[PDB]
Structure 1
């Protein structure tokens, strides 16, 4: 993740940082069977 260092908060190397805004969601994958529905153009428009 990029860390923003700015003139506003020189602090020390540890304290020279700004969180800004970030969100990350990690979900692991498992072996599964899915029925995928492909439309006329070939896009997967649904799955079960």
Structure 2
């Protein structure tokens, strides 16, 4: 009936949640964002952003 038989088919979707962090961003000659670093993961990144 309207509630039992149906075909789903293969798909899979990923869901995440965000968090207020600080980022360091690398823009290029086109101004397009080309790279980033999360300087709250490791000391070496902290050095980078400072």
Bin the TM-score by the shorter chain: 0.5 to 0.7
Deviations 1:1-40 (A, max 9, x none): xxxxxxxxxxx11223111121111110010000010011
Larger radius of gyration: 1
TM-score (norm 2): 0.63
Runs of 5+ in structure 1 lacking a partner?
Answer: 1-11
TM-score (norm 1): 0.65
Runs of 4 or more, structure 1, over 4 Å off, are none
Provide the alpha-carbon RMSD of the alignment: 1.0
Runs of 5+ in structure 2 lacking a partner?
Answer: 38-50
**Greater per-residue helix proportion:** 2
Q: Distance in 2 between matches of 1:32 and 1:17?
A: 43
